[PDB]
Tab-separated table of C-alpha atoms and ligand atoms in Angstrom:
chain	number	residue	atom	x	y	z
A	18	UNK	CA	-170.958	-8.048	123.819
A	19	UNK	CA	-168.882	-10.438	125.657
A	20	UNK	CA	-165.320	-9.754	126.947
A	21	UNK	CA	-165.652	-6.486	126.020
A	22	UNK	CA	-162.350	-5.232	127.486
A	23	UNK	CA	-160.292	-8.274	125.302
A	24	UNK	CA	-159.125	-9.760	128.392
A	25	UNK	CA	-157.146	-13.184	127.850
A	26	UNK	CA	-159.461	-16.072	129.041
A	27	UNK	CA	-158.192	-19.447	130.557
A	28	UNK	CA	-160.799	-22.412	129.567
A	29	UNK	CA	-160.631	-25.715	131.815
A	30	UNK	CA	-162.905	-28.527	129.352
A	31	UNK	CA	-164.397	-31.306	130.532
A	32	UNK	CA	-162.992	-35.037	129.165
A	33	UNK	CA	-166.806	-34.356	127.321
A	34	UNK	CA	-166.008	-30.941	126.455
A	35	UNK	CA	-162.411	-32.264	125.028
A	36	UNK	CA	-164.054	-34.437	122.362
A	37	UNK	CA	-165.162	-32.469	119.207
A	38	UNK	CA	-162.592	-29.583	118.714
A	39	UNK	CA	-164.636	-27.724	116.368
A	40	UNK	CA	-167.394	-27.318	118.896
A	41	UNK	CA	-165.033	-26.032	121.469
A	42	UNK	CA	-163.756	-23.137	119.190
A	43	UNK	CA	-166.848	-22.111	118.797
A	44	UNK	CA	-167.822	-22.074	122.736
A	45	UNK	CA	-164.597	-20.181	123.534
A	46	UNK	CA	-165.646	-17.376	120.970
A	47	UNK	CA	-169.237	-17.489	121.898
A	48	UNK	CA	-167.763	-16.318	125.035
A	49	UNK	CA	-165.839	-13.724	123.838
A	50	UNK	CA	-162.631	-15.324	123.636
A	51	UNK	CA	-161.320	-14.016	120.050
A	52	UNK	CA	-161.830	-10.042	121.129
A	53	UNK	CA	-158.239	-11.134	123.205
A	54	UNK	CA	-156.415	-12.238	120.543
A	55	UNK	CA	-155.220	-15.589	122.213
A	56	UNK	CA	-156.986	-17.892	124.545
A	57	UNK	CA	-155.541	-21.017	126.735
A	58	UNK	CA	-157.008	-23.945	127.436
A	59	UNK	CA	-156.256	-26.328	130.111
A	60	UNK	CA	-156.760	-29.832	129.452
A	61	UNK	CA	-158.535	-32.451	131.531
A	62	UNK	CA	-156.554	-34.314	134.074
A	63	UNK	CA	-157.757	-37.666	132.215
A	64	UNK	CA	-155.809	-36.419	129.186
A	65	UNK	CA	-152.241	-36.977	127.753
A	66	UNK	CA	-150.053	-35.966	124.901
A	67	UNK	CA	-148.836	-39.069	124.399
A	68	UNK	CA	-147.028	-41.294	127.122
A	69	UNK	CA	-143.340	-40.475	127.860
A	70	UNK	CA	-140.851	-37.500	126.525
A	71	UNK	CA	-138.288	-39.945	127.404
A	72	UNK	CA	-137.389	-40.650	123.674
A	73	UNK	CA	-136.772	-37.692	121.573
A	74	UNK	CA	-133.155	-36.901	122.078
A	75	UNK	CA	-132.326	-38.251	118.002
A	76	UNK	CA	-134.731	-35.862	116.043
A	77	UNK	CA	-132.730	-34.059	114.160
A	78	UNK	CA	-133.080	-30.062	114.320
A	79	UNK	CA	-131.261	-29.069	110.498
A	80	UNK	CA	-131.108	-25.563	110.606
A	81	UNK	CA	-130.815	-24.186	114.364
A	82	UNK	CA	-131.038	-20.644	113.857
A	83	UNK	CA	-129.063	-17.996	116.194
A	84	UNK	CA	-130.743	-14.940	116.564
A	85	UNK	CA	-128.937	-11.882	116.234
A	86	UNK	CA	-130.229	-8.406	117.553
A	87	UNK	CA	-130.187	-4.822	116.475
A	88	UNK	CA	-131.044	-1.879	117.794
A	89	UNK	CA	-132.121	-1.172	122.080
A	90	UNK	CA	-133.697	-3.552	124.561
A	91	UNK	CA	-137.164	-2.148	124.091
A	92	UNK	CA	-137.192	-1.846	120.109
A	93	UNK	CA	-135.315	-4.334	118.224
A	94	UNK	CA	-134.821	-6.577	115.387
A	95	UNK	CA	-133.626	-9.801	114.704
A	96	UNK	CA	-131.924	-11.951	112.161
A	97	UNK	CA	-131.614	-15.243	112.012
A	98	UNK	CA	-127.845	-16.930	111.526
A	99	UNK	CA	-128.359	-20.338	110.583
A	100	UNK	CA	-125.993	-22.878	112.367
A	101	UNK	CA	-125.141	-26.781	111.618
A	102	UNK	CA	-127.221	-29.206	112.748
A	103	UNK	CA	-127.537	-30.854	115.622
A	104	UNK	CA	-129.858	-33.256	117.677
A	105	UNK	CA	-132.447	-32.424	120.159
A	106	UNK	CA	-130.174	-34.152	122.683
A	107	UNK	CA	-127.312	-31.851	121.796
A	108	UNK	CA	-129.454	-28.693	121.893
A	109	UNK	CA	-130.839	-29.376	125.232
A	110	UNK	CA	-127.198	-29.882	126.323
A	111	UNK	CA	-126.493	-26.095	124.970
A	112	UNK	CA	-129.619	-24.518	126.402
A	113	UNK	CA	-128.088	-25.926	129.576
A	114	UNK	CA	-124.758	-25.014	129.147
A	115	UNK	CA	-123.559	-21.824	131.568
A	116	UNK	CA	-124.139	-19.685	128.044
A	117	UNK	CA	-127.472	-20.268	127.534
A	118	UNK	CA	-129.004	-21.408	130.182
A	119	UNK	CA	-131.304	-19.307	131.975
A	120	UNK	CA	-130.748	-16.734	134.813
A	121	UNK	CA	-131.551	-17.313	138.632
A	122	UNK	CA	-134.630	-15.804	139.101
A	123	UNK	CA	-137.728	-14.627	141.811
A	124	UNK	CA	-140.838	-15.267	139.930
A	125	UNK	CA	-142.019	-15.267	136.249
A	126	UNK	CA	-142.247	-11.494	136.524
A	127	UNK	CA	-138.497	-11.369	137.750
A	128	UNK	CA	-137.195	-13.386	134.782
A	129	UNK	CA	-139.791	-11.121	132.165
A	130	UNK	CA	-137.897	-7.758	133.265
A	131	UNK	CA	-134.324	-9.892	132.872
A	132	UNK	CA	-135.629	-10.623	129.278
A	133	UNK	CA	-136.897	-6.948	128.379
A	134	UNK	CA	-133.480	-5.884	130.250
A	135	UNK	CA	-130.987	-8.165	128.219
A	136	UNK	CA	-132.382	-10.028	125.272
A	137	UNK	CA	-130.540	-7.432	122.944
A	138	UNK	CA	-127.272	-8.329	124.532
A	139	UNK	CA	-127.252	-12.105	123.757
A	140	UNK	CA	-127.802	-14.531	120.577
A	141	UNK	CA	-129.696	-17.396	121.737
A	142	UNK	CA	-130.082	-20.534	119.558
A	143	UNK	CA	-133.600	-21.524	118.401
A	144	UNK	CA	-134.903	-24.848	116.821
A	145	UNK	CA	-138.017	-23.868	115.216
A	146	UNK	CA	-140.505	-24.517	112.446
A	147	UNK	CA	-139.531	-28.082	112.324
A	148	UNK	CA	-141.970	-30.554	110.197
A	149	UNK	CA	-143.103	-33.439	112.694
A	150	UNK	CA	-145.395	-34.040	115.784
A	151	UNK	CA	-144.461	-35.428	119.286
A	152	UNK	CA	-148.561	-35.950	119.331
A	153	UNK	CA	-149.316	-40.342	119.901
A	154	UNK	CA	-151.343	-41.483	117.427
A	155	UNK	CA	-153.534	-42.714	119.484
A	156	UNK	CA	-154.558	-39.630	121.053
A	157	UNK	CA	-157.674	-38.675	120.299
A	158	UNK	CA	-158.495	-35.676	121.178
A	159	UNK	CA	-156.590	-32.213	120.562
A	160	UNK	CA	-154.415	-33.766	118.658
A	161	UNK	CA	-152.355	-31.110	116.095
A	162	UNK	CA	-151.620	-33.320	113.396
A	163	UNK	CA	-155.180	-34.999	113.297
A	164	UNK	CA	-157.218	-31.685	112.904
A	165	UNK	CA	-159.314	-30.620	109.998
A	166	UNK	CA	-157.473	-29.236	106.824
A	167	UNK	CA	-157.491	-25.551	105.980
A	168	UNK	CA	-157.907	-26.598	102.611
A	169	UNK	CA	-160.860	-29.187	103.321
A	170	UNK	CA	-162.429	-26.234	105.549
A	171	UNK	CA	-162.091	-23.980	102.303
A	172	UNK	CA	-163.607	-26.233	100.246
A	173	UNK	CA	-166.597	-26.856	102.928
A	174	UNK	CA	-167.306	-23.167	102.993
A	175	UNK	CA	-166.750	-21.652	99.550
A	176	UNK	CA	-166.837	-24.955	97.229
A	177	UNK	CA	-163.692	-24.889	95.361
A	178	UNK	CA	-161.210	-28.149	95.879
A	179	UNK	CA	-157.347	-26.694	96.208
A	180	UNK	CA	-154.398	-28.382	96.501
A	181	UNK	CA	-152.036	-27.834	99.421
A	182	UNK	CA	-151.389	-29.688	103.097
A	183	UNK	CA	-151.579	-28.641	106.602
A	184	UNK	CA	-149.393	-30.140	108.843
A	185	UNK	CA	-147.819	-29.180	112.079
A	186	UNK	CA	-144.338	-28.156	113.600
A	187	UNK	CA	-142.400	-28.368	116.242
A	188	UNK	CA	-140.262	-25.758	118.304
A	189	UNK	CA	-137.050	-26.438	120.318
A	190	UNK	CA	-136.193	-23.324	122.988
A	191	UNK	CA	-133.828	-22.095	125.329
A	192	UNK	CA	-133.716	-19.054	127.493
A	193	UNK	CA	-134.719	-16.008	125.500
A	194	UNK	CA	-135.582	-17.076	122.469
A	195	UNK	CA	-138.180	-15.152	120.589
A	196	UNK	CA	-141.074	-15.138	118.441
A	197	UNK	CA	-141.473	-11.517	116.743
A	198	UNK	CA	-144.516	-9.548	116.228
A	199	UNK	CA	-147.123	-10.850	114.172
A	200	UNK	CA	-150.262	-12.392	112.663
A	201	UNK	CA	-150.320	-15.599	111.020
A	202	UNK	CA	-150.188	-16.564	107.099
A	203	UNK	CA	-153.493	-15.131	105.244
A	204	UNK	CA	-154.971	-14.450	109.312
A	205	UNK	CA	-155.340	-17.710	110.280
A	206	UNK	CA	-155.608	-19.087	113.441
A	207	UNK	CA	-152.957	-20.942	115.404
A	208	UNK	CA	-153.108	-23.416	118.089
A	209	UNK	CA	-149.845	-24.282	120.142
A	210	UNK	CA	-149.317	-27.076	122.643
A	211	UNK	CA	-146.178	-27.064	125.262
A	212	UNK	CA	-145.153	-30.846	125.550
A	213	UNK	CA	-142.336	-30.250	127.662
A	214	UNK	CA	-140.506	-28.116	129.547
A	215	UNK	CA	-139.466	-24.801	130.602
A	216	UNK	CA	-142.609	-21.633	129.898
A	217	UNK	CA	-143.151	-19.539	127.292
A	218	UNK	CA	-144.261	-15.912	127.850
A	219	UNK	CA	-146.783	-14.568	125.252
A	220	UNK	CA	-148.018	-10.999	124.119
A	221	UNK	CA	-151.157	-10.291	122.295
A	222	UNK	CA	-152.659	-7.465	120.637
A	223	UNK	CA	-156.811	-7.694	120.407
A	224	UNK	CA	-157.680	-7.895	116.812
A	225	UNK	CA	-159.612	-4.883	116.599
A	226	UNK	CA	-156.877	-2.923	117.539
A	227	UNK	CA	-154.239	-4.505	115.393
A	228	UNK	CA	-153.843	-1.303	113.195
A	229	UNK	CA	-152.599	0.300	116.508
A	230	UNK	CA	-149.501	-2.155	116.305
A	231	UNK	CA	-148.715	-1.783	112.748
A	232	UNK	CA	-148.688	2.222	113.049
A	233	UNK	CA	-146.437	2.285	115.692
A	234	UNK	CA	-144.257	-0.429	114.043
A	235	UNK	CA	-144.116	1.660	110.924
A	236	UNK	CA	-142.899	4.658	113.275
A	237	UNK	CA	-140.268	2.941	115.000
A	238	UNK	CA	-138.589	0.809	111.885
A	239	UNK	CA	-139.212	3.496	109.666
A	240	UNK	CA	-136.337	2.322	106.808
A	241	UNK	CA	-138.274	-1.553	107.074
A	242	UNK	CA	-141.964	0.349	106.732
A	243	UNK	CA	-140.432	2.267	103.650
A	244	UNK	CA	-139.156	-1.861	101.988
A	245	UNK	CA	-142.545	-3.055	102.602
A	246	UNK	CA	-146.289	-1.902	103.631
A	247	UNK	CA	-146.666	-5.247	105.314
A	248	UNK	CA	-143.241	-5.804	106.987
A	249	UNK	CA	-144.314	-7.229	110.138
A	250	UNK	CA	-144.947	-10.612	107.593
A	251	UNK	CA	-141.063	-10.476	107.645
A	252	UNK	CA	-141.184	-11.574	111.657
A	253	UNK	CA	-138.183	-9.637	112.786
A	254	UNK	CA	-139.550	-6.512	114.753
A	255	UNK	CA	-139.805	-6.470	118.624
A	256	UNK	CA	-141.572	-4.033	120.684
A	257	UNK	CA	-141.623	-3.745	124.496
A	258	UNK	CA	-144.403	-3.845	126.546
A	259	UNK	CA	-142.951	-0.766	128.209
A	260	UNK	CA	-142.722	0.728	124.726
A	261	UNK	CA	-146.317	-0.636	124.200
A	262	UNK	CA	-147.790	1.540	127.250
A	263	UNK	CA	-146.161	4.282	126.447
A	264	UNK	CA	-147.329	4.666	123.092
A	265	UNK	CA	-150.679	3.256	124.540
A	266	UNK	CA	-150.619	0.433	122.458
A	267	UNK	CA	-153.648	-2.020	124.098
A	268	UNK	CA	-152.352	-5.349	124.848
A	269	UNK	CA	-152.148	-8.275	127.223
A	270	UNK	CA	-149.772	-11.035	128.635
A	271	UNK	CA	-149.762	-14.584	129.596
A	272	UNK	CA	-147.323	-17.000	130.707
A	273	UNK	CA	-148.014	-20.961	128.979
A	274	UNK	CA	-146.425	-23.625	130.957
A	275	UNK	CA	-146.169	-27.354	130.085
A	276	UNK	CA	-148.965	-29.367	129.207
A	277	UNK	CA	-151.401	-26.268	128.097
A	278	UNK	CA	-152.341	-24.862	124.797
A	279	UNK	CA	-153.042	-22.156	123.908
A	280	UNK	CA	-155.164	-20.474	120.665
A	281	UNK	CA	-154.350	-17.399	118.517
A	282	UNK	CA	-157.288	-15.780	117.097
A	283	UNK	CA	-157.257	-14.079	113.259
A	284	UNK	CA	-155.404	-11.199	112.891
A	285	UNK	CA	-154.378	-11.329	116.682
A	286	UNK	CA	-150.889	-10.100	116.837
A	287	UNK	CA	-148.653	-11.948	118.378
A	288	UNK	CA	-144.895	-12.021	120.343
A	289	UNK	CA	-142.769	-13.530	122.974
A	290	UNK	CA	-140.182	-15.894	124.654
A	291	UNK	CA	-139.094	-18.953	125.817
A	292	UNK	CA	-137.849	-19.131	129.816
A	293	UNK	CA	-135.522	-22.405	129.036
A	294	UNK	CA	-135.111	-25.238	126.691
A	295	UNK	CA	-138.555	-26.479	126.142
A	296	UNK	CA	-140.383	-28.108	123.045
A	297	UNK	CA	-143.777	-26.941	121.584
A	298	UNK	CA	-146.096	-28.190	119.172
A	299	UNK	CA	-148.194	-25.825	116.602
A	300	UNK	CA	-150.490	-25.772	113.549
A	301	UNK	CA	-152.115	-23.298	111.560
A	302	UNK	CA	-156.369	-24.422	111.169
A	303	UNK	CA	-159.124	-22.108	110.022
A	304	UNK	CA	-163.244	-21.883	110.821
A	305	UNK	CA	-166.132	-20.235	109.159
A	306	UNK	CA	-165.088	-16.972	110.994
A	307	UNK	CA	-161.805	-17.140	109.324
A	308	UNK	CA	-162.978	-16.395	106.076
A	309	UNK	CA	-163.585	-13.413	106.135
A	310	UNK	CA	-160.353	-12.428	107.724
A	311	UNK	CA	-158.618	-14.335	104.997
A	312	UNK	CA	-160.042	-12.301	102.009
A	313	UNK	CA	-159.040	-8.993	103.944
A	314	UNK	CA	-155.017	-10.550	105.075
A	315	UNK	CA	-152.533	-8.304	104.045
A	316	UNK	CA	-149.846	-9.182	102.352
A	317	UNK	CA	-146.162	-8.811	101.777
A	318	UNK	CA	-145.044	-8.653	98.143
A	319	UNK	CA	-141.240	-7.113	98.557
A	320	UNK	CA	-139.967	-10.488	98.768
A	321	UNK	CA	-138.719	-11.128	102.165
A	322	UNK	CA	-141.702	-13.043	103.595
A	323	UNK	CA	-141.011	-16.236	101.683
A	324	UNK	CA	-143.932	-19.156	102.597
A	325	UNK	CA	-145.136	-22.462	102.425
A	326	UNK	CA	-146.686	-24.156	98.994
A	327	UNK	CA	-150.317	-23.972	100.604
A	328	UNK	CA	-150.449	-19.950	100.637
A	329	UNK	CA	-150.842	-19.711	96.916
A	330	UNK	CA	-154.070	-21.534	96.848
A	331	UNK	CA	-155.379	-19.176	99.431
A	332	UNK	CA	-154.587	-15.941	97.963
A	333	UNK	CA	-155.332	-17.382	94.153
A	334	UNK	CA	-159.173	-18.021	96.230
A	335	UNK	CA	-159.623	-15.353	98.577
A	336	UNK	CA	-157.740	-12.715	96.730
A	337	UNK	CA	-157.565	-12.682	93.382
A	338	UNK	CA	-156.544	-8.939	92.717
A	339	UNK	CA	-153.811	-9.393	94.525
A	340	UNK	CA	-152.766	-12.731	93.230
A	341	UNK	CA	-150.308	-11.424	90.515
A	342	UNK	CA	-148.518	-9.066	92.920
A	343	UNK	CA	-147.895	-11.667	95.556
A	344	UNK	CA	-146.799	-14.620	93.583
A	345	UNK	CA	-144.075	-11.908	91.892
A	346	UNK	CA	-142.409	-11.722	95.692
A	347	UNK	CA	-142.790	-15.523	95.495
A	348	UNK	CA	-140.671	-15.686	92.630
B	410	OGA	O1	-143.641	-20.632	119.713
B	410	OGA	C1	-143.168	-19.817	118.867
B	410	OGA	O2	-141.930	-19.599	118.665
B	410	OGA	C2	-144.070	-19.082	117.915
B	410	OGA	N1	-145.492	-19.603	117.939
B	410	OGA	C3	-146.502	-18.984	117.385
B	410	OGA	O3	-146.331	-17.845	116.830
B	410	OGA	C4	-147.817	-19.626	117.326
B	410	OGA	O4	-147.960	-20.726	117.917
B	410	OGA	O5	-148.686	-19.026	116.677
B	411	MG	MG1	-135.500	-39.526	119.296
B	412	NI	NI1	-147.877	-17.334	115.626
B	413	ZN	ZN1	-142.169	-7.529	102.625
């Protein structure tokens, strides 16, 4: 069995290797990549996002969101406060402002303890899950918003025709923003790209040991586990990884810096944080291997986690027993 103790692997592709994205997905895991949970990959040098960042100070972020914490710095939610809008030019002057903007620091490992430290203590401001691509068109390779449909891949494998679009989204950060635990929508995959930039430090559970995370989560947010028997769908609960090795949770880190992506893997549980204002790129796509992982997703039903138009199609496919329940918390 390849990668047998789930390690994070770092891929380098050829300009060859970079043409047919399918293909590559299927390498990656045919090296053991998915036991990790998340992958990156490292572009070739002959390869560009598109040709200058110079130009995106006037999109528009509508609902900045200001996220509140609760509870201590190693086991914590958070809620999001939405704000008024405001440019990307205006947020970028914020992230930089003597509020927000990040901490002298040693090293990536200096500014990770700061985070674990003090997150709790501040409300940073986070642009995310913005409709739009900073991808040129006429890039032609590993480009988000050019990638086979989830629905077409659907209909490829199983042979039913569903409605429903895929498109991608982008994320504005500052210092200490964060992405909760989780998996995505129906145990998808995810791909993410960092255009520009300050990092973005990533946890990841290995799939097979996903029901590790969610039993400890249901321990320590006992009164959220008691709402909902999926409540990591609501993204809101943070775990250390101090907490994590404690409770000998198995995990592993990684630190994505601009210009790399990097690839979560189905039901590979997911968290982290941004170092300082940056902008990232990501999409939701599926495989053959997905499938399966799709018809087993859990699923939240209590209401809170509240999705996109295309998720009905899915679980109306995939999971029809569980239809009715599901499209109730829709409604
Ligand atoms: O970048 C973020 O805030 C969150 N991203 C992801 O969870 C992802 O790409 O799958
Ligand atoms: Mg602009
Ligand atoms: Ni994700
Ligand atoms: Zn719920």
């Amino acid at each position: 069995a390849q990668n047998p103790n789930c390690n994070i692997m770092i891929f380098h592709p050829t300009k060859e290797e970079f043409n047919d994205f399918d293909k590559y997905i299927a390498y990656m895991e045919s090296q053991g990549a998915h036991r990790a949970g998340l992958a990156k990959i490292i572009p070739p040098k002959e390869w560009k996002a598109r040709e200058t960042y110079d130009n995106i100070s006037e999109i528009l972020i509508a609902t900045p969101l200001q996220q509140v914490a609760s509870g201590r710095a190693g086991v914590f939610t958070q809620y999001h406060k939405k704000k008024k809008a405001m440019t990307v030019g205006e947020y970028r002057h914020l992230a930089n402002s003597k509020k927000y903007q990040t901490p002298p620091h040693q090293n990536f490992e200096d500014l990770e303890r700061k985070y674990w430290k003090n997150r709790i203590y501040n409300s940073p401001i986070y642009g995310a899950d913005i409709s739009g691509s900073l991808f040129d068109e006429n890039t032609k390779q590993w480009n988000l918003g050019h990638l086979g449909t989830i629905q077409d891949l659907l209909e490829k494998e199983c042979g039913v025709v569903i409605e429903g679009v895929n498109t991608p989204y982008l994320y504005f950060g500052m210092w200490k923003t964060t992405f909760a635990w989780h998996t995505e929508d129906m145990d998808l995959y995810s791909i993410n790209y960092l255009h520009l930039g300050e990092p973005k430090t990533w946890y990841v559970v290995p799939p097979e040991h996903g029901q590790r995370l969610e039993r400890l989560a249901r321990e320590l947010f006992p009164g959220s586990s008691r709402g909902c028997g999926a409540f990591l769908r609501h993204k809101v609960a943070l775990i250390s990884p101090t907490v994590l090795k404690e409770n000998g949770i198995p995990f592993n880190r990684i630190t994505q810096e601009a210009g790399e992506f990097m690839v979560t893997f189905p039901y590979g549980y997911h968290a982290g944080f941004n170092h300082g204002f940056n902008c990232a790129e990501a999409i939701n796509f599926a495989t053959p291997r997905w499938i399966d992982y799709g018809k087993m997703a859990s699923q939240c039903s209590c209401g809170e986690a509240r999705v996109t138009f295309s998720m009905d199609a899915f679980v109306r496919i995939l999971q029809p027993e569980r239809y009715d329940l599901w499209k109730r918390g829709q409604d």
